[PDB]
Motif scaffolding. Structure first.
Motif, PDB file in Angstrom:
ATOM      1  N   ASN A  99       0.826  -1.197   0.000  1.00  0.00           N
ATOM      2  CA  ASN A  99       0.000   0.000   0.000  1.00  0.00           C
ATOM      3  C   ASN A  99       0.858   1.244   0.000  1.00  0.00           C
ATOM      4  O   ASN A  99       1.610   1.500   0.929  1.00  0.00           O
ATOM      5  CB  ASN A  99      -0.934   0.017   1.208  1.00  0.00           C
ATOM      6  CG  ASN A  99      -2.089   0.997   1.049  1.00  0.00           C
ATOM      7  OD1 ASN A  99      -2.103   1.842   0.160  1.00  0.00           O
ATOM      8  ND2 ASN A  99      -3.086   0.856   1.904  1.00  0.00           N
TER       9      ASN A  99
ATOM     10  N   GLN B 145      -2.246   4.551   1.841  1.00  0.00           N
ATOM     11  CA  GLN B 145      -2.473   4.778   3.260  1.00  0.00           C
ATOM     12  C   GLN B 145      -1.263   5.454   3.880  1.00  0.00           C
ATOM     13  O   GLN B 145      -1.403   6.323   4.749  1.00  0.00           O
ATOM     14  CB  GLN B 145      -2.787   3.462   3.965  1.00  0.00           C
ATOM     15  CG  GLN B 145      -2.865   3.535   5.483  1.00  0.00           C
ATOM     16  CD  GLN B 145      -3.812   4.605   5.981  1.00  0.00           C
ATOM     17  OE1 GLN B 145      -5.027   4.432   5.962  1.00  0.00           O
ATOM     18  NE2 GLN B 145      -3.259   5.716   6.438  1.00  0.00           N
TER      19      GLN B 145
ATOM     20  N   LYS C  93      -1.234   8.914   5.816  1.00  0.00           N
ATOM     21  CA  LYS C  93      -0.697   9.032   7.163  1.00  0.00           C
ATOM     22  C   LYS C  93       0.373  10.108   7.246  1.00  0.00           C
ATOM     23  O   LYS C  93       0.572  10.700   8.310  1.00  0.00           O
ATOM     24  CB  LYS C  93      -0.138   7.688   7.617  1.00  0.00           C
ATOM     25  CG  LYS C  93      -0.166   7.487   9.115  1.00  0.00           C
ATOM     26  CD  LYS C  93      -1.565   7.693   9.661  1.00  0.00           C
ATOM     27  CE  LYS C  93      -1.644   7.323  11.123  1.00  0.00           C
ATOM     28  NZ  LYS C  93      -0.863   8.226  12.000  1.00  0.00           N
TER      29      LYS C  93
ATOM     30  N   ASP D 225      -1.421  13.614   7.259  1.00  0.00           N
ATOM     31  CA  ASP D 225      -2.036  13.911   8.542  1.00  0.00           C
ATOM     32  C   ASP D 225      -1.059  14.609   9.473  1.00  0.00           C
ATOM     33  O   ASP D 225      -1.442  15.525  10.209  1.00  0.00           O
ATOM     34  CB  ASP D 225      -2.540  12.627   9.186  1.00  0.00           C
ATOM     35  CG  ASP D 225      -2.998  12.837  10.609  1.00  0.00           C
ATOM     36  OD1 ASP D 225      -4.160  13.245  10.798  1.00  0.00           O
ATOM     37  OD2 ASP D 225      -2.202  12.598  11.541  1.00  0.00           O
ATOM     38  N   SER D 226       0.204  14.186   9.458  1.00  0.00           N
ATOM     39  CA  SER D 226       1.179  14.711  10.405  1.00  0.00           C
ATOM     40  C   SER D 226       1.578  16.131  10.060  1.00  0.00           C
ATOM     41  O   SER D 226       1.774  16.961  10.952  1.00  0.00           O
ATOM     42  CB  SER D 226       2.409  13.826  10.413  1.00  0.00           C
ATOM     43  OG  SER D 226       3.186  14.110   9.276  1.00  0.00           O
ATOM     44  N   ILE D 227       1.718  16.414   8.768  1.00  0.00           N
ATOM     45  CA  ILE D 227       2.058  17.750   8.303  1.00  0.00           C
ATOM     46  C   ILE D 227       0.962  18.736   8.662  1.00  0.00           C
ATOM     47  O   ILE D 227       1.235  19.856   9.101  1.00  0.00           O
ATOM     48  CB  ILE D 227       2.315  17.695   6.795  1.00  0.00           C
ATOM     49  CG1 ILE D 227       3.505  16.793   6.548  1.00  0.00           C
ATOM     50  CG2 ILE D 227       2.558  19.048   6.234  1.00  0.00           C
ATOM     51  CD1 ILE D 227       3.593  16.310   5.151  1.00  0.00           C
TER      52      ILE D 227
ATOM     53  N   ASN E 143      -0.931  18.521  11.193  1.00  0.00           N
ATOM     54  CA  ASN E 143      -1.090  18.580  12.635  1.00  0.00           C
ATOM     55  C   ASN E 143       0.250  18.699  13.336  1.00  0.00           C
ATOM     56  O   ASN E 143       0.493  18.039  14.342  1.00  0.00           O
ATOM     57  CB  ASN E 143      -1.841  17.359  13.136  1.00  0.00           C
ATOM     58  CG  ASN E 143      -3.195  17.227  12.507  1.00  0.00           C
ATOM     59  OD1 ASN E 143      -4.196  17.652  13.081  1.00  0.00           O
ATOM     60  ND2 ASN E 143      -3.247  16.625  11.325  1.00  0.00           N
TER      61      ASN E 143
ATOM     62  N   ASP F 228      -9.488  -4.109  -1.171  1.00  0.00           N
ATOM     63  CA  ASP F 228      -8.586  -4.629  -0.151  1.00  0.00           C
ATOM     64  C   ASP F 228      -7.646  -3.560   0.391  1.00  0.00           C
ATOM     65  O   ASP F 228      -6.738  -3.882   1.163  1.00  0.00           O
ATOM     66  CB  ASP F 228      -7.802  -5.841  -0.678  1.00  0.00           C
ATOM     67  CG  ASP F 228      -7.006  -5.552  -1.945  1.00  0.00           C
ATOM     68  OD1 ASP F 228      -6.984  -4.405  -2.420  1.00  0.00           O
ATOM     69  OD2 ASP F 228      -6.401  -6.502  -2.484  1.00  0.00           O
ATOM     70  N   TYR F 229      -7.832  -2.306  -0.018  1.00  0.00           N
ATOM     71  CA  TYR F 229      -7.223  -1.192   0.690  1.00  0.00           C
ATOM     72  C   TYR F 229      -8.266  -0.373   1.430  1.00  0.00           C
ATOM     73  O   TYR F 229      -7.942   0.281   2.425  1.00  0.00           O
ATOM     74  CB  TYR F 229      -6.459  -0.295  -0.282  1.00  0.00           C
ATOM     75  CG  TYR F 229      -5.185  -0.899  -0.828  1.00  0.00           C
ATOM     76  CD1 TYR F 229      -4.568  -1.966  -0.190  1.00  0.00           C
ATOM     77  CD2 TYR F 229      -4.596  -0.393  -1.981  1.00  0.00           C
ATOM     78  CE1 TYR F 229      -3.410  -2.517  -0.687  1.00  0.00           C
ATOM     79  CE2 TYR F 229      -3.440  -0.939  -2.487  1.00  0.00           C
ATOM     80  CZ  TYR F 229      -2.850  -2.000  -1.835  1.00  0.00           C
ATOM     81  OH  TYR F 229      -1.692  -2.546  -2.334  1.00  0.00           O
ATOM     82  N   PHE F 230      -9.515  -0.389   0.963  1.00  0.00           N
ATOM     83  CA  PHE F 230     -10.560   0.452   1.531  1.00  0.00           C
ATOM     84  C   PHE F 230     -11.915  -0.241   1.506  1.00  0.00           C
ATOM     85  O   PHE F 230     -12.335  -0.756   0.463  1.00  0.00           O
ATOM     86  CB  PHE F 230     -10.646   1.773   0.772  1.00  0.00           C
ATOM     87  CG  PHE F 230      -9.470   2.659   0.984  1.00  0.00           C
ATOM     88  CD1 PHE F 230      -9.348   3.397   2.144  1.00  0.00           C
ATOM     89  CD2 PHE F 230      -8.474   2.738   0.030  1.00  0.00           C
ATOM     90  CE1 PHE F 230      -8.258   4.208   2.348  1.00  0.00           C
ATOM     91  CE2 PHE F 230      -7.380   3.547   0.223  1.00  0.00           C
ATOM     92  CZ  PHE F 230      -7.270   4.284   1.384  1.00  0.00           C
ATOM     93  N   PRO F 231     -12.627  -0.278   2.632  1.00  0.00           N
ATOM     94  CA  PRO F 231     -13.981  -0.842   2.612  1.00  0.00           C
ATOM     95  C   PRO F 231     -15.046   0.151   2.198  1.00  0.00           C
ATOM     96  O   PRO F 231     -16.052  -0.255   1.609  1.00  0.00           O
ATOM     97  CB  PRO F 231     -14.195  -1.311   4.060  1.00  0.00           C
ATOM     98  CG  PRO F 231     -12.889  -1.076   4.771  1.00  0.00           C
ATOM     99  CD  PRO F 231     -12.170  -0.017   4.001  1.00  0.00           C
ATOM    100  N   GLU F 232     -14.865   1.439   2.472  1.00  0.00           N
ATOM    101  CA  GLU F 232     -15.923   2.410   2.214  1.00  0.00           C
ATOM    102  C   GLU F 232     -16.062   2.784   0.749  1.00  0.00           C
ATOM    103  O   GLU F 232     -16.918   3.611   0.425  1.00  0.00           O
ATOM    104  CB  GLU F 232     -15.695   3.686   3.019  1.00  0.00           C
ATOM    105  CG  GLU F 232     -15.705   3.498   4.512  1.00  0.00           C
ATOM    106  CD  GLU F 232     -14.307   3.439   5.084  1.00  0.00           C
ATOM    107  OE1 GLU F 232     -13.344   3.504   4.292  1.00  0.00           O
ATOM    108  OE2 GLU F 232     -14.171   3.340   6.322  1.00  0.00           O
TER     109      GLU F 232
ATOM    110  N   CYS G 200      -6.449  23.700   2.051  1.00  0.00           N
ATOM    111  CA  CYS G 200      -6.029  22.640   1.157  1.00  0.00           C
ATOM    112  C   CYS G 200      -6.589  22.920  -0.223  1.00  0.00           C
ATOM    113  O   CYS G 200      -7.631  23.554  -0.364  1.00  0.00           O
ATOM    114  CB  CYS G 200      -6.494  21.281   1.632  1.00  0.00           C
ATOM    115  SG  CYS G 200      -6.238  20.004   0.408  1.00  0.00           S
ATOM    116  N   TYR G 201      -5.886  22.456  -1.249  1.00  0.00           N
ATOM    117  CA  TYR G 201      -6.267  22.750  -2.627  1.00  0.00           C
ATOM    118  C   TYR G 201      -6.045  21.519  -3.485  1.00  0.00           C
ATOM    119  O   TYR G 201      -4.957  21.314  -4.032  1.00  0.00           O
ATOM    120  CB  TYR G 201      -5.480  23.936  -3.179  1.00  0.00           C
ATOM    121  CG  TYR G 201      -5.702  25.217  -2.431  1.00  0.00           C
ATOM    122  CD1 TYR G 201      -6.808  25.996  -2.677  1.00  0.00           C
ATOM    123  CD2 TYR G 201      -4.813  25.635  -1.471  1.00  0.00           C
ATOM    124  CE1 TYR G 201      -7.017  27.162  -1.990  1.00  0.00           C
ATOM    125  CE2 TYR G 201      -5.014  26.794  -0.777  1.00  0.00           C
ATOM    126  CZ  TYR G 201      -6.115  27.551  -1.041  1.00  0.00           C
ATOM    127  OH  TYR G 201      -6.323  28.714  -0.346  1.00  0.00           O
TER     128      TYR G 201
END
Lengths: 57, 126, 225, 338, 27, 353
Positions: C95, C98, C102, C105-107, C109, C141-145, C190-191
């Motif tokens: 993958n 993901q 991930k 997300d850190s950048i 926050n 198999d990477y995402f259920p939604e 974000c853009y």
């Protein structure tokens, strides 16, 4: 054999910091109390300095 | 000195269940957002889950959503990952990690190459 | 006696000060960018379309200095404090994904990157969605939604492609947006974009968005926005 | 193989782990019970060197205790006169993002380095006219975090790809190579006689080395997060350490273990710089709530506070005679304290 | 100009009373 | 009053001699010729009838040489009456802005200290607000000194003043209000040009802006001053108002309102263009629009086009009971409770503590 090569160097690293001498902590620290008692007068910050000697007025 | 000891693992018939543990050492456990990281053989490291300080925020990877769970104990300073309905392709080395700073949110620890606040891991097979 | 070194300490000062007033004005006239995108095609194509690769270029007589981060280690927590003052971070993707989410997300926050804005690209959307739509296995198999996902009607999908490419293309775009909107609070934006195939307006979409970030920044300084 | 060799390293840890437990006679608070304290003291901002555009990363003092260098992210390298607040030189740089600056103790050379992975050396004496690049050093592969001069011909450099190095300025090649750590190396502090030096890195460990052998002598571990700053005691047997878990510590080279821990409940922000005073009694600890807090070094009490800044402090120096303290932060302003 | 016309309107009204006390004598 | 009863009679007794059935006399009003019996003595109004009407050019009073008989239109009931005593109106709207400009001044003298002391807030933007702040204090401290030469307490005194001092305080008064209508104009011009041509050097405009913040008013009050001192001086520079003279003081004041108001709506097109993109609305548009109302001076458009003798003194409660607090609103909105000072006044409050 790479990660077993570097791990053999860690025990050689841990060897040389195992065979040194080791000294009691209070005698190792009273020398720090020996330094700050004798060198207290020469330090211009913990005591105030008169306006003459300061180049920063 | 900090060090991380994972435990458990071993063999299972395809479809079973297992828990994991993470033995912490020498720091204030109540401060750090902690997490699990796996790595399949023949592929790089990949992120599994994470839990915050209290346990409020909990997230997972989409492939392992629902079937696993994560819980922490801030009283007995260990991390718990209970896994259920295991798969043939989940065989991987599973590490326990800690994000590098207290009182924050961000984390930068999915990498290989000695992120030095992860343990050597345990092996789960199937 | 002591006046002799004084005027030299004056005349060196004023000749230095005249050079700084050349340098402050050109520094306020140029916009820095950070290009931390983890994609080898992405980091090199958008150049045309050591330790650090400095690319400089101008559009509408506006100076851009684009900085690809090159010869660094994979850990990042100590050299992305050297970028909090930048205008825009250009986060290019490949993958894998993901780990892409991930990182973003850190950048968003960080304690020091809390106020900097992110321009987000979606590279390879033809060869990351239709590649699955010939395989029919890789998103699930990477995402259920994704099987739950509906294409939003207020999207502007381009006519002439697979509609289920655009189902997943907008799905990934709506997976970055749920991190950026949740608890960012008006100080950084974000853009999302995707051009990724032609030289046409890769930079112009950065241009017309870097112009936006400053305009949100000034209206932030008046308690309006 | 690796199973019993991990235990072999574990048992060599555990035997080392109890040898320092053998040495622990008492804590140092017990022997410093009757030191009459320094008490309520404080300082004042006397100067303000305001000439930089972007944020200040590093400063280094001078052996005259009068000049100082400032490296900032705008690509400017600026020498000051601290007495009369006058810019002696304003060097332009090749690459912008710099993280460290050096001032040789001969007062005759200046170095700086950063993310372009090159330590560059700048000549101050320049009898041909203006300053220029003398030579530069390209051996590291990560980034470049710190540097400290020895003479006009060799300088130890700290990098981000885990490796420290000793350099030969004329031939441009590294003399030795220091390959002990595992993380990004952050800061290094020279011994006062330049026989040893310590270094801190992101793997929460502190290695003491030998300049002549290139080997790690001891490994110091008492922290929980990555370490940003380190500074020797004035004699050469102790150092202070600042890490990103808001604690300052003290490690003595003789007893090979930690002595004091400087923390308080209200300070939960990371530490960016530390430095010692001339006697050693006053320890300075630059923080992230924007105020340098003066810590006592023998009693572990935050006695004084310097609170004049707008942004995070990033560098902190003390003159070699103890007259002045200069702190520089990310707001391009360098308050000289006294 | 708001302050300009109030300085005009009050001064003009100020003159009327000056005529008014002057015209009580010729009344 | 008392002086012209000598002064216009002193030239009358000259022209009594220069000028008989009737005698030539001074009737305590004006002078007369020793006129002819039966003829109609029609002399125009004196100067005391030019203040009753702007149509004073038709004021005439007829006396017949019968000898001397009555005014055939009687004097005051021809023009001087006006269908009561409105000293209650003039005094109270005067005594508003004196305590009106007061409250701004003690809350701008304090509020201009904070911007020029705490030294974090020496931004380019607050290098504009301080000149708006100093051009309210020049409005107040000139109006008070304007008000000092109106405390007459004597009618023959101030109706016959004509000194050079009550010229100079007036011309200083006109400069220190027209600058306040320009430092509301530039405030909108700065925030607009920081949002449409956002790629420009800002050391270029701001220095080249503050020239026409103080210098461009300094031209116009002089050109108005030298079209009366060399041309048309009658009183000390208030009560002439010949409608080709006001329009170089009133003119480029209200010109700087019409071209300011287009900059107000020219921003709430841009502010709504970001507030409506998906990155509710009508309460965020509430204190965005309402926070710019005293900044732009936008409450002057309501009476800018309307003529002064059309709207008829309703605007003076508006313009001076809400315009004389405009300096006091502006020091609260951005300085006392700013949104960047508030977490910065918390620095020196606790760090000194």
């Amino acid at each position: 054999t790479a990660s077993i090569a570097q791990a053999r160097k860690l025990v050689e690293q841990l060897k040389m910091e195992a065979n040194i001498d080791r000294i009691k902590v209070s005698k190792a620290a009273a020398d720090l109390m020996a330094y700050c008692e004798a060198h207290a007068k020469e330090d211009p910050l913990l005591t105030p300095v008169p306006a003459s000697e300061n180049p920063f007025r | 000195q900090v060090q991380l000891q994972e435990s458990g693992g071993g063999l299972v018939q395809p479809g079973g269940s297992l828990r994991l543990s993470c033995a912490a050492s020498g720091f204030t456990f109540s401060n750090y957002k902690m997490n699990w990281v796996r790595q399949a053989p023949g592929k790089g490291l990949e992120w599994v889950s994470d839990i915050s300080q209290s346990g409020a925020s909990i997230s997972y990877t989409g492939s392992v959503k629902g079937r696993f769970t994560i819980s922490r104990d801030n009283a007995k300073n260990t991390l718990y990952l209970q896994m259920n309905s295991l798969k043939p392709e989940d065989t991987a080395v599973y590490y326990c990690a800690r994000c590098p700073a207290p009182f924050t949110r961000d984390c930068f620890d999915v990498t290989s190459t000695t992120y030095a606040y992860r343990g050597q891991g345990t092996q789960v097979t199937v | 006696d002591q006046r002799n070194e004084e005027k030299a300490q004056r005349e060196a000062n004023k000749k230095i000060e005249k050079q700084l007033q050349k340098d402050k004005q050109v520094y306020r006239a140029t916009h820095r960018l950070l290009l931390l995108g983890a994609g080898e095609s992405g980091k090199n194509t958008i150049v045309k379309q050591s330790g650090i690769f400095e690319t400089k270029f101008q559009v509408d007589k506006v100076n851009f200095h684009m900085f690809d981060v090159g010869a660094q280690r994979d850990e990042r927590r100590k050299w992305i404090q050297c970028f909090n003052d930048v205008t825009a971070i250009i986060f290019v993707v490949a993958n894998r994904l993901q780990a892409a989410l991930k990182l973003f997300d850190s950048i968003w926050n960080n304690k020091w990157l809390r106020d900097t804005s992110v321009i987000l690209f979606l590279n390879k959307q033809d060869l990351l969605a239709e590649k699955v739509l010939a395989g029919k296995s890789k998103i699930e198999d990477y995402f259920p939604e994704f099987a739950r996902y509906t294409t939003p009607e207020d999207a502007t999908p381009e006519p002439g492609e697979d509609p289920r490419v655009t189902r997943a293309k907008y799905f990934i775009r709506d997976e970055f947006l749920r991190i950026s909107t949740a608890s960012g609070d008006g100080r950084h934006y974000c853009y999302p974009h995707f051009t990724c195939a032609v030289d046409t307006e890769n930079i112009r979409r950065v241009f017309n968005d870097c112009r936006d970030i400053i305009q949100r920044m000034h209206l932030r300084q008046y308690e309006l926005l | 193989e690796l199973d019993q060799l991990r235990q072999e390293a574990e048992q060599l840890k555990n035997q080392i782990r109890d040898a320092r437990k053998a040495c622990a006679d008492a804590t140092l608070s017990q022997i410093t019970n009757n030191i009459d304290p320094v008490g309520r003291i404080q300082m004042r901002t006397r100067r303000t060197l305001r000439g930089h555009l972007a944020k200040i990363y590093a400063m280094h003092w001078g052996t005259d205790s009068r000049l100082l260098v400032s490296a900032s992210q705008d690509g400017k390298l600026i020498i000051w006169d601290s007495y009369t607040t006058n810019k002696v030189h304003a060097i332009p740089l090749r690459s912008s993002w710099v993280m460290t600056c050096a001032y040789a103790p001969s007062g005759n050379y200046v170095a700086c380095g950063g993310l372009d992975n090159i330590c560059s050396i700048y000549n101050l004496k320049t009898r041909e006219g203006n300053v220029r690049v003398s030579r530069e050093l390209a051996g590291h592969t990560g980034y470049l975090s710190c540097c400290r001069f020895l003479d006009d011909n060799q300088i130890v450099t700290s990098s981000g790809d885990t490796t420290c190095a000793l350099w030969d300025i004329e031939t441009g090649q590294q003399t030795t190579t220091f390959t002990g750590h595992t993380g990004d190396v952050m800061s290094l502090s020279l011994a006062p006689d330049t026989r040893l030096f310590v270094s801190g890195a992101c793997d929460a460990s502190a290695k003491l080395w030998d300049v002549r052998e290139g080997m790690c002598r001891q490994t110091f571990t008492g922290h929980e997060s990555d370490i940003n700053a380190i500074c020797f005691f004035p004699n050469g047997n102790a150092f202070a350490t600042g890490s990103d878990d808001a604690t300052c510590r003290l490690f003595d080279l003789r007893a090979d273990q930690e002595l004091m821990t400087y923390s308080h409940d209200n300070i939960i922000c990371g530490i960016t710089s530390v430095s010692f005073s001339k006697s050693g009694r006053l320890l300075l600890a630059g923080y992230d709530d924007f105020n340098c807090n003066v810590w006592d070094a023998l009693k572990a009490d935050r006695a004084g506070v310097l609170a004049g800044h707008d942004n995070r402090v990033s560098c902190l120096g003390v003159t070699d005679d103890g007259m002045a303290v200069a702190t520089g932060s990310w707001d391009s302003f360098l308050k000289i304290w006294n | 100009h708001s302050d300009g016309i109030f300085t005009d309107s009050y001064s003009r009204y100020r003159k009327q009373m000056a005529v008014k006390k002057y015209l009580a004598a010729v009344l | 009053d008392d002086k012209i009863f000598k002064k216009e009679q002193a030239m009358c007794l000259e022209k009594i001699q220069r000028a008989p059935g009737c005698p030539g006399m001074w009737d305590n009003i004006t002078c007369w010729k020793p006129a002819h019996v039966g003829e109609m003595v029609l002399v125009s109004c004196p100067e005391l009838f030019r203040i009753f009407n702007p149509d004073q050019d038709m004021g005439v009073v007829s006396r017949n040489c019968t000898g001397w008989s009555e005014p055939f239109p009687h004097y005051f009931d021809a023009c001087g009456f006006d269908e009561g005593d409105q000293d209650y109106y003039y005094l109270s709207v005067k005594a508003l802005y004196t305590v009106g400009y007061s409250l701004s001044l003690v809350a701008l003298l304090l509020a201009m200290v904070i911007l020029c002391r705490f030294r974090k807030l020496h931004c380019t933007r607050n290098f504009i607000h301080m000149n708006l702040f100093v051009s309210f204090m020049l409005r107040a401290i000139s109006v008070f000194i304007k008000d000092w030469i109106l405390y007459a307490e004597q009618d023959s005194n101030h109706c016959f003043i004509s000194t050079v001092e009550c010229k100079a305080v007036m011309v200083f008064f006109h400069y220190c209000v027209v600058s306040n209508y320009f430092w509301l104009f530039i405030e909108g011009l700065y925030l607009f040009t920081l949002l449409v041509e956002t790629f420009f050097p800002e050391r270029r405009y701001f220095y080249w802006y503050t020239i026409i913040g103080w210098g461009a008013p300094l031209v116009f009050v002089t050109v108005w001053a030298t079209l009366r001192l060399y041309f048309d001086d009658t009183g000390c520079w208030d009560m002439n108002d010949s409608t080709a003279l006001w329009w170089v003081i009133k003119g480029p004041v209200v010109g700087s309102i019409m071209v300011n108001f287009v900059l107000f709506i020219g921003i709430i097109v841009i502010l709504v263009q970001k507030l409506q993109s998906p990155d509710s609305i009508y309460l965020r548009l509430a204190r965005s629009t309402l926070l710019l109302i005293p900044l732009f001076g936008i409450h002057y458009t309501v009476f800018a086009f309307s003529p002064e003798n059309v709207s008829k003194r309703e605007r003076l409660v508006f313009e001076l009971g809400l315009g004389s607090f405009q300096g006091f609103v502006v020091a609260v909105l951005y300085c006392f409770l700013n949104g960047e000072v508030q977490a910065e006044i918390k620095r020196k409050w606790r760090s000194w503590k």
